[PDB]
Design a protein around this ligand. Structure first.
Ligand SMILES: CCCCCCCCCCCCCC(=O)OC[C@H](COP(=O)(O)OCC(O)COP(=O)(O)OC[C@@H](COC(=O)CCCCCCCCCCCCC)OC(=O)CCCCCCCCCCCCC)OC(=O)CCCCCCCCCCCCC
Ligand code: BCL
Ligand code: BCL
Ligand SMILES: CC[C@H]1c2cc3[nH]c4c(c3C)C(=O)[C@H](C(=O)OC)c4c3nc(cc4[nH]c(cc(n2)[C@@H]1C)c(C(C)=O)c4C)[C@@H](C)[C@@H]3CCC(=O)OC/C=C(\C)CCC[C@H](C)CCC[C@H](C)CCCC(C)C
Ligand SMILES: CC[C@H]1c2cc3[nH]c4c(c3C)C(=O)[C@H](C(=O)OC)c4c3nc(cc4[nH]c(cc(n2)[C@@H]1C)c(C(C)=O)c4C)[C@@H](C)[C@@H]3CCC(=O)OC/C=C(\C)CCC[C@H](C)CCC[C@H](C)CCCC(C)C
Ligand SMILES: *[C@H]1O[C@H](CO)[C@@H](O[C@@H]2O[C@@H](C)[C@H](O)[C@@H](O)[C@H]2O)[C@H](O)[C@@H]1O[C@H]1O[C@H](C(=O)O)[C@@H](O[C@H]2O[C@H](CO)[C@@H](O)[C@H](O)[C@H]2NC(C)=O)[C@H](OC(C)=O)[C@H]1OC(C)=O
Ligand SMILES: *[C@H]1O[C@H](CO)[C@@H](O[C@@H]2O[C@@H](C)[C@H](O)[C@@H](O)[C@H]2O)[C@H](O)[C@@H]1O[C@H]1O[C@H](C(=O)O)[C@@H](O[C@H]2O[C@H](CO)[C@@H](O)[C@H](O)[C@H]2NC(C)=O)[C@H](OC(C)=O)[C@H]1OC(C)=O
Ligand SMILES: CCCCCC/C=C\CCCCCCCC(=O)O[C@H](COC(=O)CCCCCCCCCCCCCCC)COP(=O)(O)OCCN
Ligand SMILES: COC(C)(C)C/C=C/C(C)=C/C=C/C(C=O)=C/C=C/C(C)=C/C=C/C=C(C)/C=C/C=C(\C)CC/C=C(C)/C=C/C=C(\C)C(=O)O
Ligand SMILES: COC(C)(C)C/C=C/C(C)=C/C=C/C(C=O)=C/C=C/C(C)=C/C=C/C=C(C)/C=C/C=C(\C)CC/C=C(C)/C=C/C=C(\C)C(=O)O
Ligand SMILES: COC(C)(C)C/C=C/C(C)=C/C=C/C(C)=C/C=C/C(C)=C/C=C\C=C(C)\C=C\C=C(C)\C=C\C=C(C)\C=C\CC(C)(C)OC
Ligand SMILES: [Fe+3]
Lengths: 299, 273, 103, 62, 71, 39, 335, 60, 55, 39
């Protein structure tokens, strides 16, 4: 029944995070115990034999096989190469029946997406980075999948919408800001969702005496903003265009593809996997010329 | 000076501690032993507040801010610049508010009155003691108290509220707010009724308890009576402070999620789960 | 100019050309706080003012099955994210509705 | 145009002038009983001077 | 030692005693039912070796923290 | 109050009831311990 | 020591008051009755009510307002009577969309809202008239209707401030949790209402109303054994209960009211709660759009050390947009 | 033992007992109904081997 | 001891039994909250297995 | 009003009841010590 607290702002401002100590320990142990361990890695010479490899062109043959073992355990359970492949012919993108191996052609896109996350959105994911495990956590479906439902659904802030500001940056009313109180309710609903997605409260990113202030806010607010821009790219360019690839059992009632949100990576924790650093161990997924000064072992 | 009827009432007796030694008046004020301790804690606490202002960035009355320590100090006294001054002032404030209540008891005893006023004030002391002692102690750090500053404590209230995402959904807070609003309504009705029978239109006799009971009866559908409205006013005003203390002590020590998700129990009653 | 010059022959601080006995520190008010000068100064530290809203030229209705029958703006976070009851979830949207001669 | 003065500041001082006027009124009302004060130096009124003591007319009954 | 009762109405003693036992029994049951090991309505059919036991230690990777960083 | 005779007669029931209850509780703990011991 | 907190001996009278004081036009409705439970805490008589023309019309207009709200709430759960009770505190009748401004909106998109608001407002005004007429008929001062006018003033600012900013969308939704959602979002939209000085004043009088009624309630109970609750006779014929009440507060805090004038302190504290409140609402969005920045300008805002510092390229990158319209399409992303 | 009905009014003990049994019965039924193992309205037709069981220790 | 004359035994009997009950419950809940003595969950651990606060 | 004879009679039970309680408590502590020492 003890409560852990973390101070995140100045003395006396009550910018604090509170956790039920028992509840947090069970959540944390529930991550530790399943956390999948990595293979060791090794450094051969020699030219690449692959017949139909289009993304992983740039890694050694040993690093490639090491990556496939990781992908199996992170998405399908360990050694489950049959989840993606016609195991008699790994280069195939179709079954013997000619029907396409939809998971393999999705997984090729998910590699490009992961490289794009780890490369272009380092202002968000920094040197923790993401792997397939971050979303999938050992299962084919991540958490927090969402579909079209209503026009005013706030999760469209992570796809095709842009503005969320409502506060005036001046004393007097002006034509610059004609925001409705209903729009402030909409931002408030959106912000509760982000708070729950991380398991934090509003004071993690704001001094609530002025929500619009960046100077009074913790630096996490700047990281959070880059998370919005990242999700828009992830949803608009990688997840949403996979609509013709999935079986109709995966699609939404509008026939749209499942889309991601903050909770998909974070799963109610302030960092994904409480900050477990795995991307550093898998250069196939860096999308980056060095990871924290460790250079990419390219061929 | 004295009210024209006062001198007759200024007897010795009714003290709790000091006996006759402090049993005297200073102008209008009764002193007593707890008068002495009051002025000690008031003066010390005030001058330390002025020292806090002096070593802070401004003398602007609204902006003065004496902040509690960082949470890392736990239940220890921090360095005085770092929040220890807030901790000393908090001890003075407790000493002053306690002394004030016990002085009121000496005054009530000397006048042969019931002890209602000291105890009604205990409801406010309870709420203060909850904010600066009980709730910080259950959270394990004095740094959870509110800062002493006319607007900086409103920044604390704001941030504590949003620590639970949507504090309006706190169920004890809804009760406390209902008491505060009902109290202000009842105060306006009681004030209006007494003034309306004692100040009727020119050329009208002074009214009576019967008229105010008749008016009150067709306002609420029942007549509360003279003792009843004072019992109700005391119940509502003190009950608001007690439910306020409950609403803040449950926030953090006993509940940590957002308040809107507390209402999940209501959605899951088995008649309609 | 963040610290006063030091006498090399002693390590002693020189203020306005003359020594001080003691360890010099730069005085500041509690935690280095400074009162806010102006609105213009507070705003100068913030981001630039938000860009204008994107507003659509004209409105097309969603299908009736995509229209919410609860118009309260926060309901998706305050109720629906915890409420999983199947009947209540079905009540959230208007049912399909079709001119009889199209059936 | 006036940069510093604004309608919220004006309205606030209008309220303060009214409110202090009200406190004076209420303190005159508070002094209809028990005043002027007895003292060793003779009668004392404090400030503001109290309103006069008020007589009440009872009814002739029916 | 029976002289203890001369001070008391025996009907009221019994009502006081039954109320004490009823509260104590319900407290102990609800404590156990809220535990992991003795949550018997869900897990009562587990054998004694199969039943939960509290952790003799937690563990972590070195970069992980249950709590966010902050002063 | 009550005569010494009645306080003694009452004490006999209270002792006997207490011990009978503690016996039944002893069996309940014997059964619980057989099913899932706590030490 | 007897606390005088509840009445151990009630007395009945077989004939009764409740037949009013001489009152002229209108009718006394029902026969008086006693509740033993009411008699424990206060006076036991639960009894006849007066309406007249203004009271009858107020109930008709008000009932329609309540029906419109409830029927819309019940329609919003698809007429499900179980979900109507289960979800009741989350249900609302919601104001019109912002793009209409002050124009009449569609019936299901705020038209019912404006109708319910209209009939509620008329019902409140007719109730004020009913109270005013009753105070004069009983030959009383007009203190109560003017106290009630202060509450009506604050209520009316939930119409006039939306009118002044130019949109019915800004009005308060009818609903238990939904109107609290509005209350929070209003403070958010206008940049933290704690820095509105009339809001601060309104709180000072709301708290002061609790301080005064706690003090006055306790004071009268403390002298009730000496007849201090017979307040009208203590005003016209001062007894020792009044004298002791004056001396307690004089000796405690150096000054005192009278048995009459404490009710004026009470009346003004309650009335000023809603009067200062209404002024603060009317100023919001019309004169001041960000109360925190008004606080900075006028020196209200205590300084804290910076928690983050932006670079100039971050200052351009981190500006957002003002929130716009919702997407009125379901895009395909396939090419 | 029947002499307790001179010490206590039977009329009032009976009412108290009926009330106590009703409350205790309803509490236990709803505790079971809210569980996984004994959600008998949804899963009552499952065999005892098929019914849910609360998670065991990992034995590691 | 004439302390039973300065103090009524019945007053002191109930007062002590109350104090002992409050003290016993405080100590049980303190131990039940600890790591080392949360005996309902971990009571079957051997003394070598039970947790210890860090050096 | 207690007599010092009532006191002497009461004090014999009070002292031995205290001894009984202390005996049971110290057995309880030694069992607890043998299961999980706190030093
Ligand atoms: C926003 C919503 C607000 C919501 C809250 C609003 C609260 C409103 C209530 C509080 C204010 C009323 C207080 C009061 O009336 O006390 C009685 C006192 C004197 O009583 P008296 O009967 O007229 O005279 C007695 C005298 O003739 C014989 O007495 P004696 O010979 O025994 O002793 C000598 C006197 C000398 O007087 C003083 O020392 C005055 C002390 C300070 C008076 C108040 C100054 C302003 C407030 C405090 C500022 C300093 C505060 C640090 O000794 C005494 O009488 C001492 C007894 C009175 C003690 C009063 C303490 C009041 C503390 C109020 C704290 C307010 C905090 C905000 O009265 C006065 O001195 C004059 C008061 C005049 C009304 C105040 C409003 C004036 C508005 C401005 C008008 C223009 C300038 C006057
Ligand atoms: C009836 C008057 C006496 C009494 C008189 C006797 C006599 C005489 C005998 C016992 C015997 C026994 N009693 Mg005894 N006993 C009483 C109260 C108790 C209480 C109690 C909670 O108060 C308990 C736990 C016991 C327990 C016991 C056992 C330890 C023992 C073996 C029989 C058995 O298993 O009985 C189980 C019973 C219970 C757990 C509860 C008591 C039930 C009621 C009160 C009846 C007790 C009489 C007994 C069953 C008679 C046996 C038949 C013989 C022909 C005498 N008695 C009352 C106060 N009891 C026998 C013994 O010592 O053998 C070693 C024996 O000869
Ligand atoms: C995040 C939330 C915001 C906030 C947002 C607002 C907003 C927005 C408002 C207030 C208002 C008030 N706030 Mg604020 N408030 C916050 C924090 C606080 C805190 C605190 C400890 O933090 C406190 C104590 C207060 C206190 C107060 C009051 C002083 C004030 C209302 C006075 C009153 O009597 O209203 C209650 C009285 C009424 C509403 C009058 C009603 C009278 C009518 C006639 C009754 C009709 C009944 C009818 C017949 C029946 C209808 C039946 C139904 C139709 C079924 N606020 C923060 C900063 N607050 C109001 C104000 O005045 O602001 C300046 C206001 O509008
Ligand atoms: C319990 C119901 C309500 C209540 C009742 C109540 N208050 C009462 C009484 C009663 C019945 C009294 O008898 C008593 C009295 O005598 O009134 C005149 C009192 C009183 N209520 C007071 C105020 C007050 N009550 C409040 C609240 C309430 N009081 C409740 C809502 C509030 C709020 C909500 O803000 C305030 C400000 C005083 C006027 C008075 C108590 C006077 C007293 O204790 O005097 C001795 C002490 C001093 C004169 C000064 C002490 C200075 C300190 C040593 C240093 C400062 C420390 C402080 C914490 C700093 C805070 C800074 C702020 C900006 C945050
Ligand atoms: C000074 C500020 C405070 C204040 C004061 C105040 N309020 C007041 C008054 C005063 C002095 C009154 O005299 C007045 C009153 O009547 O009090 C009992 C009122 C009042 N304050 C009210 C509420 C209220 N006050 C609040 C607040 C405040 N009131 C402030 C704190 C709040 C809050 C905090 O939100 C509320 C909700 C009301 C109880 C009352 C005004 C009642 C009124 O206007 O009612 C209008 C009628 C209806 C809504 C319709 C009811 C419908 C029936 C249920 C239908 C039944 C069927 C019917 C019979 C059919 C018709 C058939 C015909 C043929 C008969
Ligand atoms: C699934 O289908 C794809 C079709 O693209 C096959 O991919 C082939 O091999 C790749 C390396 C190459 O890049 C690609 O262009 C393509 O040549 C994949 O191997 C899977 O094959 C099975 O289904 C094929 C299909 O298209 O239905 C089928 O191929 C058919 O068409 C080719 C001519 O394009 C013809 O040679 C086959 O005889 C014909 N067969 C049938 C049953 O229709 C494959 O058939 C054969 C013999 O390979 C299927 O694979 C098997 C083991 O039967
Ligand atoms: C469906 O249409 C709506 C309405 O345009 C889009 O929502 C817009 O964007 C949001 C930021 C905002 O919240 C909302 O108010 C509204 O402004 C929604 O995202 C969907 O977009 C797709 O369809 C758009 C459409 O208007 O039909 C289309 O827009 C482009 O094409 C139309 C002609 O078909 C032309 O009139 C527009 O000027 C043009 N606009 C742009 C910016 O290109 C979108 O196309 C593009 C590239 O945005 C559609 O979006 C997608 C990904 O298909
Ligand atoms: C029971 C009765 C109690 C009465 C209490 C009165 C207290 C408070 C309310 C007063 C009304 C406030 C009106 C506020 C609107 C206001 O200020 O709008 C100003 C214009 O100025 C104005 O309208 C000036 C307004 C002056 C108000 C009256 C003052 C004189 C009488 C005082 C009486 C006191 C005693 C009674 C515009 O402001 P802006 O920021 O847009 O301008 C700059 C734009 N670039
Ligand atoms: C965090 O730790 C946590 C989890 C909380 C764990 C720790 C818990 C702790 C600290 C628990 C402490 C427990 C405790 C401590 O003392 C418990 C003490 C319990 C006690 C004293 C029980 C006593 C029971 C006595 C009974 C049942 C007596 C019944 C009497 C009867 C039946 C006789 C009736 C006869 C009559 C009426 C006469 C009729 C005949 C007539 C008329 C005739 O013949 O005429
Ligand atoms: C955070 O720190 C933490 C973790 C909390 C740690 C710190 C803990 C601390 C500081 C603990 C302190 C403990 C303490 C200090 O002294 C504890 C003191 C304990 C004591 C004194 C216990 C005494 C018990 C005595 C008992 C039970 C007596 C029973 C008597 C009986 C049965 C017979 C009664 C007489 C009768 C019936 C008369 C009949 C005849 C009659 C009537 C006739 O004949 O008339
Ligand atoms: C069959 O009967 C049933 C069962 C349905 C009856 C049951 C009904 C139920 C369950 C009703 C429940 C009602 C509830 C829970 C209501 C909750 C209400 C709350 C909490 C309201 C809170 C605040 C509302 C405010 C402040 C609203 C203010 C509105 C105003 C001031 C509107 C004014 C509008 C005007 C003057 C309109 C004028 C009309 C014109 C044409 C001029 O348009 C502007
Ligand atoms: Fe009164």
């Amino acid at each position: 029944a003890a409560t852990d607290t973390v101070q995140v702002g100045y003395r006396g401002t009550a910018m604090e995070q509170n956790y039920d100590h028992g509840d947090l320990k069970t959540k944390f142990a529930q991550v530790k115990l399943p956390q999948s361990p990595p293979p060791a890695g090794e450094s051969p010479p020699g030219p690449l034999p692959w017949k139909n490899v289009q993304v992983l062109n740039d890694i050694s043959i040993a690093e490639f096989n090491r990556t496939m073992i990781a992908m199996s355990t992170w998405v399908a359970g360990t050694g489950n190469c049959a989840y993606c492949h016609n195991v008699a012919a790994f280069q195939d993108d179709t079954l013997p029946n000619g029907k396409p191996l939809y998971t393999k052609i999705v997984a090729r896109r998910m590699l490009q997406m992961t490289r794009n996350i780890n490369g272009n959105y380092s202002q968000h994911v920094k040197n923790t980075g993401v792997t397939c495990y971050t979303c999938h956590m050992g299962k084919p479906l991540p958490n927090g999948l969402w579909f079209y439902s209503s026009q005013t659904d706030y999760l469209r802030h992570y796809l095709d919408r842009d503005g969320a500001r409502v506060i005036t940056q001046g004393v007097a009313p002006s034509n610059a800001n004609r925001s409705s109180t209903k729009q402030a309710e909409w931002t408030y609903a959106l912000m509760i969702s982000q708070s729950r997605s991380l398991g934090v409260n509003c004071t993690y990113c704001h001094n609530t005496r002025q929500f619009a202030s960046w100077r009074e806010a913790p630096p996490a607010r700047v990281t959070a903003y880059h998370g919005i821009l990242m999700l828009r790219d992830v949803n608009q360019n990688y997840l949403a265009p996979l609509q013709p690839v999935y079986p109709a059992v995966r699609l939404g009632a509008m026939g749209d593809a499942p889309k991601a949100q903050c909770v998909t990576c974070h799963n109610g924790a302030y960092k994904p996997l409480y900050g477990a650093q795995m991307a550093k161990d898998f250069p196939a997924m860096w999308g980056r010329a060095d990871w924290n000064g460790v250079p990419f072992p390219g061929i | 000076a004295m009210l024209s009827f006062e001198k007759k009432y200024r007897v010795r007796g009714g003290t709790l501690i000091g006996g006759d030694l402090f049993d005297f008046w200073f102008g209008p004020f009764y002193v007593g032993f707890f008068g002495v301790t009051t002025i000690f804690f008031v003066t010390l606490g005030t001058l330390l507040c002025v020292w806090g202002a002096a070593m802070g960035p401004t003398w602007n009355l609204w902006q003065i801010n004496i902040a509690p320590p960082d949470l890392k100090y736990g239940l220890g006294l921090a360095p005085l610049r770092e929040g220890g001054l807030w901790q000393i002032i908090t001890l003075c404030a407790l000493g002053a508010f306690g002394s004030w209540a016990l002085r009121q008891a000496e005054i009530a005893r000397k006048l042969g009155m019931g002890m209602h006023i000291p105890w009604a004030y205990g409801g406010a002391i309870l709420a203060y003691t909850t904010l600066v002692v009980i709730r910080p102690f259950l959270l394990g750090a004095w740094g959870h108290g509110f800062p002493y500053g006319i607007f900086s404590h409103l920044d604390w209230v704001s941030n504590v509220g949003y620590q639970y995402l949507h504090f309006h959904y706190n169920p004890a807070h809804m009760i406390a707010v209902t008491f505060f609003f009902t109290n202000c309504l009842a105060l306006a009705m009681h004030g209006s009724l007494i003034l309306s029978v004692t100040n009727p239109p020119k050329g009208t006799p002074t009214g009576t308890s019967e008229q105010e009971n008749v008016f009150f009866r067709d306002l609420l559908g029942y007549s509360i009576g003279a003792i009843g409205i004072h019992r109700l006013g005391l119940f509502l005003a003190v009950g608001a402070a007690v439910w306020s203390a409950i609403c803040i002590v449950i926030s953090g020590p006993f509940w940590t999620q957002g308040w809107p998700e507390w209402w999940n129990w209501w959605l899951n009653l088995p008649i309609w789960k | 100019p963040t610290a006063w010059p030091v006498d090399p022959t002693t390590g002693q601080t020189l203020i306005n050309g003359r020594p001080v006995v003691g360890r010099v520190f730069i005085m500041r008010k509690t935690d280095g706080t400074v009162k806010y000068p102006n609105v213009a100064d507070v705003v100068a530290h913030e981001a630039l003012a938000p860009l204008p809203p994107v507003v659509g030229s004209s409105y097309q209705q969603a299908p009736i099955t995509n229209q919410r029958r609860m118009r309260g703006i926060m309901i998706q976070s305050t109720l629906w994210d915890m409420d999983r009851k199947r009947s209540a979830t079905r009540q959230r949207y208007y049912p399909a509705s079709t001119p009889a001669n199209q059936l | 145009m006036m940069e510093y003065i604004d309608g919220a500041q004006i309205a606030l001082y209008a309220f303060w002038l009214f409110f202090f006027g009200l406190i004076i009124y209420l303190r005159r009302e508070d002094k209809r009983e028990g005043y002027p004060l007895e003292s060793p130096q003779g009668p004392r009124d404090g400030w503001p001077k109290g309103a006069p003591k008020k007589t009440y007319v009872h009814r002739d009954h029916g | 030692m029976h002289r203890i009762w001369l001070m008391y109405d025996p009907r009221r003693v019994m009502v006081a005693l039954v109320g004490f036992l009823a509260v104590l029994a319900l407290v102990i049951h609800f404590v156990l039912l809220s535990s992991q090991r003795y949550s018997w309505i869900e897990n009562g059919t587990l054998g004694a070796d199969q039943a939960p036991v509290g952790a003799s230690a937690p563990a972590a990777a070195a970069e992980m923290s249950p709590l966010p960083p902050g002063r | 109050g009550m005569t010494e005779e009645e306080a003694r007669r009452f004490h006999g029931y209270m002792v006997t009831g207490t011990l009978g209850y503690v016996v039944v509780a002893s069996v309940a703990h014997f059964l619980a311990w057989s099913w899932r011991p706590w030490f | 020591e007897y606390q005088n907190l509840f009445t151990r001996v009630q007395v009945r009278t077989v004939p009764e008051p409740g037949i009013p004081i001489d009152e002229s036009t209108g009718t006394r409705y029902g026969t008086g009755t006693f509740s033993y439970l009411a008699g424990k805490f206060g006076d036991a008589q639960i009894g006849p009510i007066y309406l007249g023309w203004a009271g009858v019309l107020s109930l008709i207009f008000g009932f329609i307002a309540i029906e419109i709200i409830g029927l819309n709430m019940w329609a919003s759960v698809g007429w499900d009577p179980v979900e109507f009770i289960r979800q009741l505190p989350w249900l609302a009748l919601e104001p019109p969309p912002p793009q209409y401004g002050l124009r009449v909106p569609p019936l299901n998109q705020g038209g019912w809202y404006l109708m319910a608001g209209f009939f509620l407002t008329v019902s409140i005004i007719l109730w004020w008239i009913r109270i005013y007429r009753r105070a004069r008929a009983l030959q009383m001062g007009s203190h109560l209707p003017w106290a009630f006018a202060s509450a009506i003033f604050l209520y009316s600012t939930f119409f006039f401030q939306p009118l002044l900013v130019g949109s019915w969308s800004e009005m308060v939704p009818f609903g238990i949790f939904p109107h609290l959602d509005w209350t929070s979002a209003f403070s958010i939209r206008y940049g933290n209402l704690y820095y509105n000085p009339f809001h601060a004043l309104s709180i000072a009088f709301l708290y002061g109303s609790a301080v005064l009624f706690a003090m006055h309630g306790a004071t009268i109970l403390a002298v009730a054994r000496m007849g201090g609750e017979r307040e009208i006779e203590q005003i016209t014929d001062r007894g020792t209960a009044a004298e002791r009440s004056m001396l307690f507060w004089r000796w405690c805090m150096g000054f005192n009211a009278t048995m009459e004038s404490i009710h004026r302190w009470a009346w003004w504290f309650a009335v000023l709660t809603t009067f200062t409140g209404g002024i603060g609402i009317l100023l919001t969005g019309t004169v001041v759009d960000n109360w925190y920045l008004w606080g900075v300008k006028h020196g209200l805002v205590a300084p804290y050390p910076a928690q983050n510092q932006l670079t100039p390229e971050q200052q351009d990158l981190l500006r957002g947009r003002y929130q716009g319209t919702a997407p009125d399409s379901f895009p395909s992303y396939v090419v």
